[PDB]
Design an enzyme around this catalytic site. Structure first.
Site, mmCIF file in Angstrom:
data_model
loop_
_atom_site.group_PDB
_atom_site.id
_atom_site.type_symbol
_atom_site.label_atom_id
_atom_site.label_comp_id
_atom_site.label_asym_id
_atom_site.label_seq_id
_atom_site.Cartn_x
_atom_site.Cartn_y
_atom_site.Cartn_z
ATOM 1 C CG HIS C 67 -0.495 -0.198 2.736
ATOM 2 N ND1 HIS C 67 -0.052 -1.452 2.250
ATOM 3 C CD2 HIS C 67 0.012 0.844 4.153
ATOM 4 C CE1 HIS C 67 0.617 -1.411 4.404
ATOM 5 N NE2 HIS C 67 0.649 0.178 3.992
ATOM 6 C CG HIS C 69 0.519 3.589 5.273
ATOM 7 N ND1 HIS C 69 -0.425 1.799 6.136
ATOM 8 C CD2 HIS C 69 -0.501 4.377 5.420
ATOM 9 C CE1 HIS C 69 -1.120 2.854 6.511
ATOM 10 N NE2 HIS C 69 -1.498 3.922 6.320
ATOM 11 C CG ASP C 71 5.225 1.743 7.691
ATOM 12 O OD1 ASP C 71 4.513 2.712 7.226
ATOM 13 O OD2 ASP C 71 4.954 0.932 8.711
ATOM 14 C CG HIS C 72 4.282 -0.897 4.328
ATOM 15 N ND1 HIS C 72 3.982 -2.063 4.409
ATOM 16 C CD2 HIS C 72 4.254 -0.590 5.898
ATOM 17 C CE1 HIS C 72 3.616 -2.344 5.556
ATOM 18 N NE2 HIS C 72 3.899 -1.277 6.883
ATOM 19 C CG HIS C 156 -4.908 -0.351 6.620
ATOM 20 N ND1 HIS C 156 -4.622 -0.380 8.044
ATOM 21 C CD2 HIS C 156 -3.542 -0.523 6.451
ATOM 22 C CE1 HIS C 156 -3.352 0.452 8.067
ATOM 23 N NE2 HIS C 156 -2.929 0.348 7.105
ATOM 24 C CG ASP C 177 0.311 -2.148 7.284
ATOM 25 O OD1 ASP C 177 1.194 -3.663 7.084
ATOM 26 O OD2 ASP C 177 0.621 -0.873 7.265
ATOM 27 C CD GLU C 202 -0.528 -6.613 10.371
ATOM 28 O OE1 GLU C 202 0.582 -5.993 11.459
ATOM 29 O OE2 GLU C 202 -1.418 -6.105 10.218
HETATM 30 ZN ZN LIG Z 1 0.034 0.955 6.895
HETATM 31 ZN ZN LIG Z 2 3.294 -0.164 8.801
#
Ligand SMILES: [Zn+2]
Ligand SMILES: [Zn+2]
Lengths: 401, 718, 429
Positions: C67, C69, C71-72, C156, C177, C202
């Protein structure tokens, strides 16, 4: 098991299968390859027919059908001859095939080979048919249709063990191409592969939309000779996506066809040009119409009106008629002509991976598949790589199996 | 340090070791551990440990609490190491058995915490900080830690295992500047090369690779002659144990004239023959990069780097190890050609290139691998006929070959090459089945081959009439990344050949300038930016679509639009217009009104860049200022001075400072210079020219955030 | 022919994210991510532990971004241009239309913090978006003639997926996620009975079992009926819209007259992020915002968008309204250390602005974490619905994994791994 083969064409087959006591004649569609020897609507465009000289039809028991692209010969098989058996097919198949049959006759009564048929035969032919769904086992051997994913109603037939695969796809919307349902068989008949083995479909889809939008963006008209059912739907779901993504703005889409209203089950779908079309006709436009062969239908009228300007364009998508010979009767010409064959069938890189998953014993295909193509004779991958070697056949042949 | 942080230290040490608060933030420790290094590196350290006698009790508690976290231990080991880096602090930290207790079995080594790779990485990085003086050298030898590092250089964590081998090399080279430590290390390495499993051999060859290269002292020379017998005996097994580590050793040794002065080139020459068709390449290129080498070796290097190509050029109409690989499977064939074209491309721009560098033969070999990929070649054997069935439609080989054919154009050659090069290039553009990543490279190869030809001669104008009908078909592709790639080609081509009567006759004759203008309304925002840039260029050359209905169409985007990409692309166009010189005041006044009202920080920053260009052309002086105040610049510059974006405030700060200078050497200049003097600028410049975290990255505010928890604050997505 | 997994990031952590998987003969990278809170070469993963070989294009076979985000996906313009890598990058369709705006909005922060030492530029985000190959849900696509991937539906966020990798008999499904509670916004994740050899899930909300949707509305209602102003620091896309659709509904169903404001400057997906939202599962009371009327006295609701109270509008607005007992701020997300929004969320009420000043903070301060992850019930629900042969945990906390690992070990009777940051994990096939 003595497979009589009545037609040699690789895409529009005609195979009779002899058994202990039963006889089966699968996939009995016509061969439009001959309707363009003639001149457009000086004679009557006459059609070919499977060679019935090999055996009589009064002995044939059942007639299976996979898809609508090969059914137009059903009149000649169950009406003119002494055929007295049943005919199985699928629900969305016969719903579409009826539509194509009405179009063809409508085009021709407007003003061995045989003349065209009339509305009288098709109704009596489309009557004596018993309709089935996927996996609904039918008795007789116990034949049963499966899902091929090629067309809306398009079924492979597994007889019991002998499997049969004709005109199947793997690139999909329809039901998926099942593969576990047809393994562990003695022999496996495999017909109806792609005819443009090199070019991928996705390349040609982007090639249709690009030559289209290049003309209408320059004030020109685009004529697309196509069928009312079949590849025309995949063109439209891609053309709708293209117009939304690439940004084509305010171009009409006139889908004029004698039988168009029941053909969908901003595309305006007028029934003919003789009518309110000549009034509501805004250019630059796009007209999906006519018959692919260019030998009759409304396209003959459009092909003459626009053919005298370098701004217009005609695009071919039916990978069955050679566009160079289907266009000669119109030369000299000023209108651009583009060949963009969209063909979604089993590629040769796909058919082998099937065999190394289904793992049959014996396979049988026409001569045109056990040899590399006539263009790229050197390319040895454009051929059915199977072990043991596949038993080829030809027109009017009797195999032993 | 400083008084603000100092008075906050005793509370810090108390909370870190207390067993009731939640564990401290891992990010905070790393940001705190980086702080201590700053202090101790510029001052003395033993003075610190007395002036603030609370850190020692933190270190002392590490081996007493027996219930510390997993991450506070790691912080302390690295902190004990970074203090005991100077000799004075190393001994002062021993009265009480502190250092031999932390890095010994009493401390976090013998307990049930040597299981989390965070503590181990902290132990190793703890030693590496203290092992910088001879006192520590004796500490590592006697109690036993080199024997421990040997066990850490086998770990299941690449982060730990590779940091241990970086410590043996630091201990070894420090031991000698054989001594006690060094003799044991070289014994274990030499005993590892003779191992039977691959991981042990790889651990040795990585300690050697760092030795040669980080230290050229004549003690290393003695080491190479002693190990060469065993290193050479590695090319005798069925699988060479660690090939890519083996190769990296030969290259770091070879690129030093010391070691190369008899047994080196004999192993290298023998490696080129016995290494498989996956490492023979990387070795053969490393040779060709060197100046000193036996000419008989380079001639064998180059000839094994061209071998995969030479097989393709002969199996089509115009070595068993290679002909097997190209036919073994599709993965290995596409694998060997992609690496060969990458190597042979890193080689061309070099002055130490092999000579004679075959230009005409390489191009013909590169063009005949684009046709096989495309699918229009012609075999001449059964291996050529099998090649058409593999390479056909392989995007990875077509991308590798198209980058190379673009490189093979910076060396001057006959025009027979260009005609042959463009002919195969143009076939990739006017073709279905070319992916959008291949069309990006065909468009970049076609540009280097055009701008490197010997008005525009007799052959280029013909290629143009063949080309632009292909550019029209690409500006309509059903992918935003292809309509984008074709608008950066039309821009760069028009940036060089914009003033050639031939190019302007082949451009306007086609329908390109009309498609380039219907793309100012493409739905994708990346294509509006490319279309605006192309129109900006095409209009500086006087090639408008058949002149000011554009500035009305561009100024509409700058005001009524959604995305930022077209807006900041419009500003670069208006700036290039003003600087080039394509009623000027009414232009600058209309634009600087849409900049100041905008919400993006890139559009405003270019606004002041458009002012600078206009300001320079203006600076008898009273109207110069009166015009300058007519456009509204002073309204713009002052509002941006106190702004929510520091990059925007610097541009306006640099602007007025440049304005406060010119207005000195020469409303009214007197009054406006007061308004310029009334506010401070140097103090403003010094504040703006610093980071935007000068408060939240400070050690003061870092310390407070660790000992002042107790609110709602766990870790989640950004 | 074993499978190896190396959590180069997000192992027992929720910072970076990167997972190097080596199915029988192919290497694959999943979710090349980032870590805010740093300002140097530590914000990105360490790809050197991959480049101890030939170039990356030679080693890897594909990259997969679950996705949008940060941090990804926030190291993609770096991994693909500075490190150097030419190959397919398989996102979904909304993720490709949201990433270029998030990566362009974070680059405003980095260029502000003076942290562009080894960093991507705006030209390098474009060239990286051209290597992307969008996919469709449930629509298998072909990589390298033997490596077959396929997406699913996760939830999410708009665009998230749950990829599956196949090299024949071996298979790995990487659930990013995902959610299992059928929330009123996107939906619950669904996977079919595939039974892969591994499942890489996760464990964010491991030890935790619509109160939040109401309590947000009540607190805005309680502070707007007293002549007080609200402030919501938020990023350009993601959570800003799922609140606007929430405030717009509650306000017509109560017939309020207070002005709401919203402006990003880089985009107008306030009415286009919805265009992509319809195929997956026009405003009245929401106007545009400017610095002009952030001081006219009256009740308000503002969505400023430099993020978690970084330098920008949010910090400058919050700096004004801080001297008032009636105003409030709502932090609808997790803030990292080193930023104004982190101090406030935990304790401190006396900040320090530029100079030797000290700003006293008397507003209310709330924290309505609106993230939507799975939970102990949901994770157990998926492992049963997926039926794997082993489970691996990433993207969580150090202990909540340890407790959750027991329950999956015992109840479901399967071996579950918990690899640290950098620990390879081999399991036979
Ligand atoms: Zn996420
Ligand atoms: Zn994350």
């Amino acid at each position: 098991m003595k497979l009589y083969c009545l037609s040699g064409h690789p895409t529009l087959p005609c195979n009779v299968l002899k058994f202990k006591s039963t006889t089966i004649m699968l996939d009995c569609g016509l061969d439009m390859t001959s309707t363009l020897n003639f001149l457009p609507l000086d004679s009557v465009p006459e059609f070919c027919l499977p060679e019935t000289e090999l055996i009589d039809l009064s002995t044939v028991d059942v007639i299976l059908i996979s898809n609508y692209h090969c059914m137009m010969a059903l009149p000649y098989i169950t009406e003119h001859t002494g055929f007295t058996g049943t005919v199985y097919a699928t629900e969305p198949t016969v719903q579409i095939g009826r539509l194509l049959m009405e179009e063809l006759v409508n085009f021709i009564e407007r003003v061995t080979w045989r003349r065209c048929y009339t509305m009288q035969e098709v109704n009596s032919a489309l009557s004596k048919i018993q309709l089935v769904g996927y996996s609904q086992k039918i008795e007789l051997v116990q034949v049963t249709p499966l899902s091929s994913g090629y067309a809306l109603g398009s079924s492979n037939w597994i007889i019991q063990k002998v499997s049969y695969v004709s005109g199947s796809s793997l690139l999909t919307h329809p039901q998926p191409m099942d593969q576990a349902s047809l393994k562990n068989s003695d022999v496996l008949v495999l017909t109806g592969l792609t005819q443009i083995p090199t070019a991928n479909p996705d390349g040609m889809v982007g090639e249709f939309c690009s030559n289209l939008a290049l003309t209408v963006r320059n004030g020109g008209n685009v004529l697309v000779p196509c069928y009312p059912s079949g590849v025309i739907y995949d063109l439209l779901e891609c053309l709708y996506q293209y117009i939304d993504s690439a940004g084509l703005s305010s171009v009409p889409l006139y889908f004029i066809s004698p039988v168009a209203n029941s053909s969908l089950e901003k595309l305006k779908h007028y029934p003919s040009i003789h009518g309110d079309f000549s009034n509501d006709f805004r250019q630059p436009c796009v007209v999906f119409t006519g018959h692919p062969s260019l030998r009759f239908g409304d396209v003959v009228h459009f092909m003459e009106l626009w053919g005298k300007s370098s701004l217009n364009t005609v695009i071919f998508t039916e990978p069955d008629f050679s566009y160079l010979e289907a266009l000669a009767p119109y030369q000299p010409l000023a209108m651009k002509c583009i060949y963009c064959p969209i063909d979604t069938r089993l590629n040769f890189i796909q058919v082998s991976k099937l065999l190394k998953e289904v793992q049959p014993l014996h396979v049988v295909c026409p001569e045109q598949y056990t040899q590399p193509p006539p263009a790229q004779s050197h390319r040895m991958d454009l051929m059915i790589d199977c072990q043991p070697p596949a038993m080829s056949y030809r027109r009017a042949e009797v195999l032993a199996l | 340090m400083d008084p603000e942080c100092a008075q906050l230290l005793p509370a810090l040490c108390a909370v870190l070791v207390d067993p009731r608060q939640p564990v401290a933030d891992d990010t905070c420790l790393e940001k705190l551990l980086d702080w201590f290094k700053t202090v101790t590196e510029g001052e003395s350290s033993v003075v610190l440990l007395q002036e603030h006698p609370c850190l020692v009790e933190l270190l002392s508690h590490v081996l007493k609490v027996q219930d510390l976290s997993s991450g506070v231990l790691s912080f302390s080991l690295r902190l004990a190491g970074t203090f005991a880096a100077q000799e004075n602090c190393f001994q002062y930290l021993q009265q009480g058995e502190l250092l031999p207790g932390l890095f010994g079995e009493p401390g976090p080594l013998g307990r049930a915490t040597w299981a989390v790779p965070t503590v181990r990485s902290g132990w190793i990085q703890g030693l590496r900080s203290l092992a910088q003086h001879p006192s520590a050298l004796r500490f590592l030898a006697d109690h036993g830690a080199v024997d421990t590092i040997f066990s850490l250089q086998g770990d299941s964590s690449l982060f730990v295992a590779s940091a241990a081998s970086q410590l043996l090399v630091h201990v070894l080279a420090l031991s000698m500047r054989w001594p006690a430590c060094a003799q044991k290390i070289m014994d274990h390495v030499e005993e590892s090369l003779c191992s039977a499993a691959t991981p042990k051999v790889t651990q040795a060859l990585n300690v050697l690779t760092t030795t040669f290269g980080r230290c050229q002292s004549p003690w290393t020379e003695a080491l190479w002659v002693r190990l060469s017998p065993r290193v050479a005996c590695l090319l005798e097994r069925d699988p060479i144990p660690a090939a890519h580590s083996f190769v990296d050793l030969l290259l770091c040794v070879a690129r030093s004239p010391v070691f190369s002065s008899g047994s080196l080139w004999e192993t290298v020459a023998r490696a080129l023959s016995c290494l498989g068709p996956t490492h023979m390449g990387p070795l053969a290129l490393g040779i060709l990069k060197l100046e000193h080498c036996p000419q008989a070796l380079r001639t064998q290097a180059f000839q094994v780097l061209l071998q995969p190509l030479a097989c393709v050029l002969k199996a089509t109409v115009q070595d068993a190890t290679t002909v097997d690989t190209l036919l073994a499977s599709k993965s290995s064939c596409a694998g060997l050609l992609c690496r060969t074209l990458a190597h042979l491309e890193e080689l061309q721009p070099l002055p130490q290139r092999p000579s004679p560098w075959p230009q005409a033969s390489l191009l013909g070999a590169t063009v005949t691998v684009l046709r096989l990929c495309d699918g229009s070649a012609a075999p001449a054997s059964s291996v050529g006929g099998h090649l058409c069935g593999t390479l056909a439609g392989c995007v990875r080989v077509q991308r590798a070959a198209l980058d190379f054919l673009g490189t093979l154009s910076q060396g001057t050659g006959p025009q027979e090459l260009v005609t042959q090069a463009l002919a195969v290039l143009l076939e990739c553009l006017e073709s279905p089945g070319s992916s959008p990543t291949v069309l990006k490279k065909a468009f970049q190869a076609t540009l280097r081959w055009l701008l490197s030809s010997p008005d525009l001669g007799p052959l280029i104008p013909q290629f143009l009439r063949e080309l632009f009908p292909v550019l029209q078909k690409r500006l309509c592709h059903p992918c935003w990344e292809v309509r984008d790639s074709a608008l950066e080609f039309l821009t760069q081509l028009s940036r060089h050949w914009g003033g050639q009567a031939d190019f302007r006759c082949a451009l306007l004759a086609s329908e390109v300038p009309q498609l380039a203008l219907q793309l100012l309304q493409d739905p994708e925002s990346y294509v509006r930016a490319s279309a605006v840039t192309a129109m900006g260029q095409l209009s500086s050359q006087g090639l408008h679509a058949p002149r000011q209905s554009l500035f009305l169409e561009l100024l509409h985007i700058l005001s009524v639009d959604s995305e930022g990409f077209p807006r900041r692309a419009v500003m670069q166009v208006f700036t290039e217009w003003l600087r080039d010189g394509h009623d000027t005041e009414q232009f600058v006044a209309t634009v600087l009104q849409a900049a100041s009202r905008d919400l993006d920080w890139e559009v405003r920053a270019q606004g002041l860049e458009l002012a600078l260009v206009f300001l320079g052309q203006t600076l008898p002086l009273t109207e110069a200022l009166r015009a300058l105040c007519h456009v509204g610049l002073f309204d713009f510059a002052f509002c941006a001075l106190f702004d929510c974006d520091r990059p925007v405030a610097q541009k306006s700060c640099d602007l007025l400072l440049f304005l406060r200078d010119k207005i000195a050497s020469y409303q009214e200049p007197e009054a406006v210079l007061a308004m310029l003097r009334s506010l401070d600028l140097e103090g403003l410049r010094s504040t703006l020219a610093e980071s935007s975290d000068h408060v939240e990255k400070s050690p003061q505010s870092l310390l407070q955030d660790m000992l002042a928890t107790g609110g709602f604050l766990e870790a989640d997505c950004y | 022919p074993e499978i190896r997994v190396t959590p180069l990031g997000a192992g027992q952590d929720v910072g970076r994210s990167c997972i190097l998987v080596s199915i029988a003969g192919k290497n694959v990278m999943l979710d090349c991510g980032m870590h805010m809170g740093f300002n140097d070469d530590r914000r990105f993963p360490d790809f050197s532990y991959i480049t101890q070989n030939g170039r990356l294009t030679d080693f890897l076979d594909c990259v997969i971004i679950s996705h949008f985000h940060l941090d990804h996906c926030g190291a993609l313009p770096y991994f693909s241009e500075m490190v150097g890598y030419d190959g397919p990058i398989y996102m979904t369709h909304p993720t490709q239309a949201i990433c270029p705006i998030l990566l362009e909005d974070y680059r405003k922060i980095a260029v502000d913090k003076k942290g562009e030492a080894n960093f991507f530029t705006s030209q390098m985000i474009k060239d990286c978006m051209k290597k992307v190959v969008a996919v469709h849900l449930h629509q298998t696509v072909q990589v390298d003639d033997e490596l077959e991937i396929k997406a699913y539906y996760a939830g999410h966020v708009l665009g998230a997926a749950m990829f599956q990798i196949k090299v024949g008999s071996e298979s790995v499904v990487y659930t990013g996620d995902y959610n299992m509670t059928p929330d009123r916004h996107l939906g619950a994740a669904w996977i079919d009975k595939c039974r892969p050899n591994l499942l890489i899930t996760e464990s964010t909300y491991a030890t935790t079992i619509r109160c939040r949707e109401r309590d947000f509305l009540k607190k805005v209602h309680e502070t707007v009926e007293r002549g007080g102003k609200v402030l919501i620091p938020v990023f350009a896309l993601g959570r800003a819209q799922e609140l606007c659709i929430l405030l717009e509904t509650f306000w017509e169903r109560m017939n309020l007259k207070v002005p709401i404001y919203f402006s990003t400057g880089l985009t107008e997906k306030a009415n286009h992020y919805y265009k992509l939202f319809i195929p997956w599962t026009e405003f009245k009371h929401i106007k545009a915002f400017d610095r002009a009327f952030a001081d006219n006295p009256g009740p308000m609701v503002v969505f400023a968008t430099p993020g978690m109270l970084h330098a920008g509008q949010s910090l400058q607005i919050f700096r004004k309204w801080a001297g008032n007992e009636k105003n409030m701020v709502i932090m609808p997300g997790y803030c990292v250390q080193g930023t104004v929004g982190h101090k406030i969320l935990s304790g401190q009420r006396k900040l320090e602005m530029e100079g030797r000043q000290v700003l006293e903070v008397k507003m209310q301060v709330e924290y309505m974490s609106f993230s939507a992850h799975a939970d102990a019930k949901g994770i157990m629900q998926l492992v049963g619905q997926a039926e794997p042969e082993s489970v691996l945990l990433v993207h969580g906390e150090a202990k909540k994994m340890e407790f959750l690992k027991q329950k999956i070990e015992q109840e479901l009777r399967v071996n579950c791994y918990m690899p640290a940051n950098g620990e390879t994990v081999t399991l036979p096939t």
